């Protein structure tokens, strides 16, 4: 592993904390905030597998249809590391992946803080996810239409802002790397999972942090995973708009994260 993986440990401090990326991005979403970390934490970072970062030969795109897949990577990560015990911080789908990793191996997480994370994107009874099944239907066929002007309009709706601003050419830039066939197939896996079964079963304390404005996730899921996740919880809104505010609004989330990470 950690090469499949582009592992790094980097840092100086005291307690060890795992930074997990969501699709479409990798590792170099956290830039910003790394530098600002490491005289306080001890930070590992790593890329989940399929990201464009990543050599995905002969990708199982079996063992990618459920999250477990992606949990398995980062305790066999974790595990390979001899990491016990650590925070955990997952943006987007690798907070739902945190989560579930931890169903598996809660001792190894002191504690859990989720962005722009979300259990389910679908609709349903009693259950604002933000899209419906038309909405996912023709975003698929646009990705395999022409998956280059699907990412010039995705990502400055995922980042928000401008066509032009520095956050949307980097997402992007790695959101059109992810090789095509793959893309497509990961987001039909997180676009259309369905976690909230689990959220009960977690027992590690959860620090849920989501933009006020995500376009991806409505607020209405904060308090969602706040009163579905089985452990402690508290909710504390961004006064930011996107879904990769680490990246487009370091200067906002950087004293957020880090109030969350020493309480």
Same mark, same amino acid.
């Given at each position: 592993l950690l090469d499949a993986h582009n592992v790094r440990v /980097? @840092?100086? @401090? +005291?307690e060890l904390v795992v930074l997990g990326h969501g699709f479409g991005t990798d590792q170099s979403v956290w830039k910003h905030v790394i530098p600002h970390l490491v005289d306080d934490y001890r930070v590992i970072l790593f890329d989940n597998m399929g990201a464009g970062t990543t050599d995905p030969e002969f990708f199982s795109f079996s063992r990618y249809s459920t999250l477990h897949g992606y949990a398995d990577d980062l305790l066999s990560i974790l595990e390979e590391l001899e990491v016990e015990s650590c925070i955990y911080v997952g943006h987007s789908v690798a907070g739902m992946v945190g989560c579930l990793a931890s169903l598996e191996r809660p001792e190894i997480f002191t504690k859990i803080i989720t962005l722009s994370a979300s259990p389910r994107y679908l609709n349903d009874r009693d259950y604002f996810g933000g899209f419906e099944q038309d909405d996912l239907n023709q975003l698929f066929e646009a990705m395999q239409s022409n998956f280059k002007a699907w990412v010039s309009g995705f990502a400055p709706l995922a980042v928000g802002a401008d066509i032009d601003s520095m956050a949307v050419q980097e997402f992007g830039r790695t959101l059109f790397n992810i090789r095509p066939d793959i893309a497509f197939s /990961?987001?039909?896996?997180?676009?259309? +999972?369905?976690?909230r079964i689990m959220l009960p079963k977690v027992t590690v304390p959860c620090h849920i942090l989501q933009s006020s404005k995500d376009l991806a996730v409505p607020l209405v899921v904060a308090d969602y995973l706040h009163h579905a996740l089985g452990g402690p919880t508290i909710v504390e809104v961004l006064p930011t708009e996107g879904h990769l505010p680490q990246l487009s609004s370091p200067d906002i989330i950087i004293p957020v994260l880090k109030r969350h990470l020493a309480g």
């Open positions: /980097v @840092g100086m @401090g +005291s /990961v987001a039909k896996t997180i676009f259309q +999972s369905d976690l």
